[model samples]
Each structure stands twice: as structure tokens, then as C-alpha cells.
Target: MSKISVTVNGRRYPWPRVPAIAVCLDGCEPAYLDAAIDAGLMPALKRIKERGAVRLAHSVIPSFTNPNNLSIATGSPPAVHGICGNYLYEPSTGEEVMMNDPKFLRAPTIFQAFYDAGARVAVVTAKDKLRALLGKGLRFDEGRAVCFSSEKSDKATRAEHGIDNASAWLGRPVPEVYSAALSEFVFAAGVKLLREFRPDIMYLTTTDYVQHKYAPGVPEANSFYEMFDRYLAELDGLGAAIVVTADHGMKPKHKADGSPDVIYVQDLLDEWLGKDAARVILPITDPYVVHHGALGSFATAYLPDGCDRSEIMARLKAIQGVDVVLGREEACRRFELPEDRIGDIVLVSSENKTLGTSEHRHDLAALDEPLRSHGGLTEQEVPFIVNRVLPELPNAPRLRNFDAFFYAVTAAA
Candidate 1:
């Protein structure tokens, strides 16, 4: 292996020859990092950053886990990978499906490239939805790659995950996907793999169950960070260049009384456009509804056939919480969204509010507490850090979490 510069998204990034690992701290907001460091909650990360670089990065639009994670893996925007959000509406089939499969992706992942070049690659995610997508093009036939989720560790097989029993391999039962324990398990699994196999490239992604439930500086959040820092220190101590970033940031999108400040766009549209005249699709809708009741600050409105576009735009714009309403083309241009997959008009809510389809479409009871969600300008800011000092870029453009790959490979090489 030789030190070189790899080109991605029209920019050249350095690549060093050594063990490299990228850790995605799911829903890790910039404020959370600041608070954690100020409170001395992340001693390991604090020490590592002094020796390296830590900067604020803008997460991709919609700022959801699927798109940003794939963005990190592919080193490109959602326009290149075609995963604009966690849930996508297929106009052809008239079906709204979870964006958790590789078939929806249009770009090659760094893992695939590494495996194709005969380097061992491993990807561990807290949620199982990302495993198949992250492992899309990697060759795992000869144990060249290991991709598995802590959520589905019990289902892992030798032919699939390069391990017969994940529980036995880790010496503990897999944690529940909805608990903070899952993220701890993910870190533990990553540490175990790095120590045992020493894969050349490793991608470790976590869940936001803790971040979604608790605010930064809270006991729960601090405890998770402490556990994470311990594992991170172990990874760094084992001679791996560690790159840290987040898929998106978290925001408390609720009213002072603890009720969700939700804007039911579909219900409002029905008052004007009549019932069933428009279909509102909440991109934030995912299997995990407890954290956010399928509500977020961003959504897409599929207008009725030949409906008044200008009127809908004007109505959506007049709404209190609606930040911006753009047509498909304009939205695609501004947010780098896929035109065909998006709705007729896009709606973005202000920082303090979240948007939902309708009272019937969403179950308020599903939410256990006030909503803390993302998918808007408020949740786009995240921390980008590396454990080793990186060579300076000529202009040093604003960093993105996806650049973690460049940072990791460069530091390792």
C-alpha cells in the first residue's frame, strides 16, 4: 500500500497506508459535542481531537440517517446515490417504501471499491436496515468483507456475516435495537473485529435511540458517550486512524408544554384543496416511530392530477412553520434531490416545528414523549473529527461527514 490522493466529488483527498476506521455517531449534534467536551464527558475524544482536527460540517438535506450514511459511504451527495431520505415515494408503483435497500442506490461505495481491490472491509451498523445497502458491492464470499447489524446479530451466518454466531463471537447477547445498549453493542463489536481481523477499512455506524430520547448533557446521553469514548480509545490505541462524524443532529421540536409542535400539512391542505386532493409524504417516517411520530420538519406534497401548483405553493408558504416550499425542479436544484422520486412540491418546516401527514396518518400515542427530530436546517450541523492531524487542503472548503472516508484513508495510508 502507498500513500496517495483519492478523488471524490471533484476534490482530491489524501490516502495513507495504515488501519483506518470511520465512526458515525448517529444524531450527534454539534451542540452535543460542545456540551460533552465542556462537561468532560468525552476524555478520549477530547485528547484525540487535540492531536487531529475537529470542525463543523453540514449534513446533507433532509439530514436523515439513510442518505447521510450512504453519503459517507459513497463520498457524494444524495443526488449521486439516489437516497434522498429515509422513506421514499415511488411514483411508478405508487408505493412508499423504506430507503433501506441497495437497489435504490446509484453510486459505488468505498467499501465495494476497497473489497474489489483485495483489501478486507468490514461494516457494522446498529440498525439492520443499513447493512444490506452498505454491503451492496462488497465481496464477502471468501471472508473478504464482514457486514452485519447489532439489531440482527442473531440471524447472522458464516456465509453472510463471516461469523457463525455473533453472540458467541462477542461473548454477549445482542442488545435491543431500540435501547442505548444497541449502540454500545455496535461499538463493542467494532472493537472486537478490529482487534481480531484488523480489517484495512472499517465503517462503524450507531443508532440514535439514546440521542432521540435524551438531550445532550443529560445523564443518559453522557453515559452513552462515556462508553463510546472507552471503545474509541481502544480502537485508537490499537493503531487505527479514527474518523468521527454524525449522520445528522438532533433538535427538540416540541412546545413548552411538552406537546409536539406539529403542522399537519395534509389536514391543512384538505381544508383548501378538499380531502384526498393532495397526498403528503413525511420522509421522516421510518420503522422507529417512538422517537418521532413519523413527523419531521421536511415533507413532500403530491398534488392531485392537474391541481393548482401556484395556489398550493402559496398556501404552504403562508403556513406559520413552513420555511420553504419549492416545486420539484426547484427543490431538486436547491437540495440536490432526485426529481423523479420527489413529489410535486417540497415543504420544509422551521426549526421549532415538525410536519406530519394528518391526524389519521400518524399515531400520536406511538410517541412516548415530546418529539426530538431532524430533517431541516436546524439538524444539519454536525461535528467532523479525526484522531490524527491531516494535511491542509488548499482552500479548505466546509467539511461534510462523508469526507470521513478521505480522512480515514489518508491518515491510515
Candidate 2:
């Protein structure tokens, strides 16, 4: 077996230093690993994993990234994290909202605890939402963070052409696309920083756009594999213990292709629930009953005036294609929907279809035009893969989330 080697700052550390971590955004399938292996691009990963790796089955929330990522990071379900979905309802303001801030996370994230433990910390990503997701003053000892974006900027590098551009996307600045350049650029930047600052805990998150937009079974995924493999080989040589995992998986078919298979709440209300239901028109990525699902619609009593709490749920259940119209009581008990933040009555869409609207259009219809998505269980529940790289940490227990990472890395350290 290959010996484990890792370095921190200028000093060499023994294997299994607090279990370094890598997270892939929208990564949901084990086949992604097969792709990297089949391409023979990641020799470092294969050699190190000569011992073995642990595959963590992820049961992330049915639909959406915020809730699921928060779940992975905090090791608690959305009921506890307070992030029910990508989009949420604020009964206090009678407004439909997006849960994009760390404030929404109701649990302890590994990074936060790592920072608290006085360990150097860093995170690199293709995601533009990290600041909001992880919050400020977190892991600032090393304090080097960058996000790839399509918009014109002095700080970002173009994924498509390697040109320096900082255009923003998905309500934040991020790379133009999820390409091989993305893995190369981010890895180069992260490895350089790790070498310089020597963070005890670090995260490298990749984008799932390649799988979502380029067709899941195509060469695009293989391309990402190749880039990831090369980076791992070079970084592993640097002697930093490494780990890799995905946030969610992507389905092969396009969820967008104008499919009437899914029903929009607006149409459902107009057709079956009656025009009265029009008053409660909020688009949701999930069909769950409460705590971010449409079921929280009745929570409007906490919203602005003229919002009917009783009628909202009544209209919701009246509509077809809705499974169960859960009351706020049930939602709070089961999904942990804060009384003030969710709709009173959630309308669960029939089949696998979800409630849709025009809000947050960029992520769903990005440059590559994704056919698959992480939100919703349809075909997206990804798993975590732990490639053991050291003798001491050879038998670390399997963990499915960032919370477990926090516990493992902190305790091991």
C-alpha cells in the first residue's frame, strides 16, 4: 500500500490530519467516480485509495440545494437548519423569499467549529453563494476565497476561455461554466493557498453544470473527471491528505424541456382549485406540505395584512395534483417549518412535478441549459466518498455530511 503523505505550512504532518474534505456541488451519482477512474486521469486518488474508500449514501431533502447543502454541512435535516428550500416564504413580510444566507442554517457547521477550534480553514468553490452559505469571519486565518463567474470582473477567470472575466450569475458571481478549466484554476489557487497558509481544514467544491447541461452520459463529465484527476495527482504529491464528495446528483433527462408532465401551481389553482386560489400564488421547488413547501401557505397570518391564512390552505388542498395539504402544526412538527417563515398550507404536486415560476431563473437555465437538477429527489440524491489516505485514519467511520466531518476532523485532530 502507498504511504500517506501530507504537509501543512512548512511542516510535515503525519497522515490523517483532521481529515481534509472536498465537496462537489450538485454531485449525486457514484458514476462520477467511475468516470474519473475510467479516464485514468487521477492516479493519486487511485494509489491512495489502495487501502479502500467509504461510500456514504446521502438522503438529502427531496428538492433544492439550500436545504440539502445545509443538511450536508450541518449534519442535521432541514427541520433543524431552518433552511427548507431554495425559495422560502416570509409570513412576517407576506413575501416569497430565498434562503441564501448562513443565518438560515440552524446548526453548527464543521467550518465554524473548525474556526472555533483555532484550526486554519479555507474553502474554494465554483459556487458564488459561499459567503452567504457559510457566513463571514469564518475560517479567516487563511482567508483566501474565490468564486468563478461568467460576468466581467477583475477577480475571476473565465471557464470557457481562461480569459479573466467576473460576470455574475445565479444571484452571485461564479465561473462562466463547469469546465475542466474550472477544476484546474480552482485547484491551482487552493493548493497554492494551502501551501502558504496551511489550513487544518479545507474544502474544494466543484460544479455540477457539466453533468446537468452537457448530458449526463456524455464526454463532458469525463472532461471534468480528467481535470479533477490531474489536480488530485499534483495536490496529493504536495502531501495534503485529501477527501472528495458530492452535494447532489443530476438526472439524465432535462427537467425543463417544456414538459406538461409537471403542473405549475398557478395552472393547477386556475383549473381545479378555483380563482380564489390565485391569491396564494408562490412557486416552490418542492411539493412538501410545510416548512418551505407550499403547505406553509396558510402561515400568512403572520404576513402582511389582507393575506388570508385560512383561505390559502383551503385553496391549496382544493387543487388537484396536490398530495397532502399539511397544516402549520404538522409542518412544524415534521419539517420544522418555523411558524413565521413558511406557508400555512403546502400543496404537494402530483407525480414528480414541482411548482414553477419565473423567480431564480439563472441557476435553472444557466449557460449550458441544465437538463438535470439537484433539488428534488427525482434523480439527484448523491453520496459521499471517503478515500482513505493514511494508516492512522485508515478505519475512519463513514459520514454523510459536513457535521460528521466536523466531528471526525476535530476529534481526530
Candidate 3:
């Protein structure tokens, strides 16, 4: 069989016949990993770092789950993959829609490419939303490939999910979507598949419900890290080259008084223009509204047709805690986003705050604690580590969390 090859960080690399596993610890910040290692919480990761390469990998702009996860799977950016956020505004329908379907993708993913190249692949995620996207263009004949998520465990069958009975196979009930037990189930399933099916490569992704609620160094966060460390040890013992990374980092975006530091951007826009004069969409909006209250640092505003564009940009730049404001074309060009999927005006909040459409649309009661959201520069730094030595690649300009696949395959080979 011809070996698979992929490009990452602007450099092309060959993929050998390697038994590898790539783990995406969704919403893992670099500081979280550092703190866990210093506290002796993640002994397996610490030992891997001692002999392997660890770097602060940059996540794509907006720093949301959908874009970053796809970037990791495709080894490219949103500009190439065409998914800019978890949710996007469909200008044609004048509505916001979730970007979870594979039809939205414009590029091929590593899973599909590897499977096409005659390599056995398996992709498992904690949330079902990612399965369809990551599994795009992949085949499942003869148990050669499997793609599934924990949320859709009920639908799993021998023909469709490559497993006849998920509950019986995992020796436990399918986990709830919002609980940490879901991540545990994902890891357990991956280990079981590795031992039995022996796929050449695997993608194991988990949710960030715990990270969203608990800050770094907290007991709950530490406990989660300890559990993650044990799983890493188990995967390593299976003799697969393991690479660990994250979709994006989590940050605390609240005031010291334990209240959300929020900017009601749409309300401010209505005051500047008139009621219903503009449509402000938070691309960070997703099914996990309880974790972030539908608030984030980045927002897209579609101004009224007659509104003055420059005037709106000036007002947005003048708002307190507003970091940057850009026109639609400039924002797409600068952030490498698809021009057709962006807003007329883009607004980004400072590191300490988040922007929302209105107070009524978001639920303060939904937030069990103070808000801690992502989608800004502060949350774009993630940890990238592989359990093998890495040679310096001067030609590789960008070190991104998405490059974990390249490192994992080559390192294990």
C-alpha cells in the first residue's frame, strides 16, 4: 500500500505504517497542563514531556470547538475548511445555524485520507455533533473503520457503529452528554477498540464540561487531570504512538466580584441605530449554552442596509472592553475566514470580558458559576505534546495543535 502523507504548519510529512493515537483534550489550556504537572497530578504526561516534545500550540481564530477540532482533523485552518465557529449566520436564511454537518467542510480530513490510503482508522468523540463532520468521506465496511460519539450510543449497531452493543461492550451504561462520565466512556471505548480491532490510527476527543465549570488547580479540575493521566498511561502501554493536544484553551472571563463581565453589544447597537436596525450574532452560540451562557469574546454584526459602516466601526471600537473592530472583508482576510460566512462588522472583547446579544436571551441562572468562556486571544493557546522525540523543523512556520496527527503518526512509526 502507498503510505499516507499530510501537510502541517506549511510542511509536508509522510505517514508511515504506524499504530498511533491522537487525543484531543477539548478546551485544555496550557496553564492547566502546566499546573497539573507541577502539582504531580499528571504523572504520565510529565514523563512523556521528559522524553518527548511539548510546545504551546496556537489554535485558529475565534478559538471555538468546531473550527479547531476540524482544523486538527484536517491539518488546516478555517479558511481552508470553511467552518469558522460552532454556529454561523446563514445570510441567505437570515438565521443562525449550527456548523456541525460535514457538508460545510471544504477540505478532506486526515481520517478520510488515511482510510482512502488503505489504513485502518477509528474516530470516537464525546459529543455526537462532531462524529458526522469527522467521519465525512470515511467508510465502515468489514469493520475496517469506525466513527461514533458517546452522545449517540443508543444508535450504535454492528453494521453502523462497528459495535453491536455499546453498553455491553463498554461494560457500563452510555454516559450522559453533559457529565464527565461521558469523557470516561469515550476513553474506555477507545482503549477497548485498540485492544480488539487494532486500528492503525485513532482519534479520541472529549468534552470540556468539567474544564468549563472548574478553574485550573481546583480539586475538580485536578481530579479530571488525574483521570486523564491514567488513560494516557493505558494508551501508551498498548504500544501506540500517542499525541495529546486540545481544541482550544479555557479562560475565566468574569469580574473579581464573581459576576459576569458582559457587554450587551446588540443593545448598544440598537441605542446607536434604532430598534431592530441590526442583527448581532454570537458565533460562539452552541448546544452547551449552560456552560457559557451564549456569551463569548467574538461576535458578528449584520448592520442595516442603509447604516454607515465606518460609523458603526468607530462606535464599536470606542466601547469599553472592546479590543478590536474590523470591517467584514478585512476581518475575513486577517483571520483567514471565509468571506461569505462572516458578518458585516466584527467585534472582539478584551480578555476579561465577553459580548452578548441581549440580557433576556442569555440566562444568568443557567450559569451555575461565574462565566468562563473562550473565543479570544487569551484562550487560543493550547498544549501540544507527543510521547516521542521530535526534530526541529525550521520550515514549519506555525506550530498548531492541529499538527498533532502528523507528529503522532511519525513518532510512533
Cα lDDT of all candidates, in order?
0.82, 0.48, 0.81
For 322-401, candidate 1 gives per-residue lDDT tens digits of 99899999999987778877889988899889887777645454656677988887888888888887756111136777
After superposition, the stretches of candidate 2 with alpha carbons farther than 4 Å from their true spots are 1-19, 47-50, 139-184, 253-261, 276-340, 345-354, 357-370, 389-399, 407-413
Residue 227 displacement in candidate 1 (angstroms): 0.9
TM for candidate 1 is 0.93
| Clashes per model (N, Cα, C within 3 A) | 6, 31, 0
Q: TM-score order of candidates, best first?
A: 1, 3, 2
Q: Summarize candidate 2's per-residue lDDT along 253-354 as a digit string, tens digits.
A: 324463323334544344544443432434334322232223111111122345564665677666664555665577666544555455555544443344
lDDT by residue (243-269, candidate 3, tens digit) is: 888888888888998778888887888
Error of 1 at 275 (Å): 1.2
Q: For this target, which candidate reaches the highest lDDT against the unseen true structure?
A: 1
lDDT of 2: 0.48
| lDDT pick, better of 1 and 3 | 1
Pairs that clash in candidate 1: 16-410, 16-412, 16-413, 17-412, 17-413, 18-412
- Sorted by lDDT, highest first, which candidate order results? 1, 3, 2
